[PDB]
């Protein structure tokens with residue numbers, strides 16, 4: 001599913017265990033993402049799902065849930 005694909009991208013990048021990759025988990029505060037990690041995650045989500053995440057929207061992506069909910073409104077699943 002889209003959800004699992006997103007979680008896998010996050011696990012690959014951060015080396016965090018999937019049990020912690022929940023919808024309300026903050027990339028920075030909960031998953032330990034540093035500034036480079038967040039830039040790389042956004043880049044990865046864009047390339048994987050063939051969409052763009054403009055800077056203004058990227059700044060508003062703080063949790064795993066934000067990414068999933070946003071993507072579900074941009075792709076079919």
Ligand SMILES: [Cl-]
Nearest residue numbers: 002075076077
């Ligand atoms: Cl999809």
Ligand SMILES: [Zn+2]
Nearest residue numbers: 008009011012
């Ligand atoms: Zn993988």
Ligand SMILES: [Zn+2]
Nearest residue numbers: 017018019020
């Ligand atoms: Zn486990």
Ligand SMILES: [Zn+2]
Nearest residue numbers: 025026029030
């Ligand atoms: Zn937290």
Ligand SMILES: [Zn+2]
Nearest residue numbers: 036037039040
């Ligand atoms: Zn890199």
Ligand SMILES: [Zn+2]
Nearest residue numbers: 042043046047
């Ligand atoms: Zn890009």
Ligand SMILES: [Zn+2]
Nearest residue numbers: 046052053054
């Ligand atoms: Zn972009």
Ligand SMILES: [Zn+2]
Nearest residue numbers: 054056057058
């Ligand atoms: Zn916007």
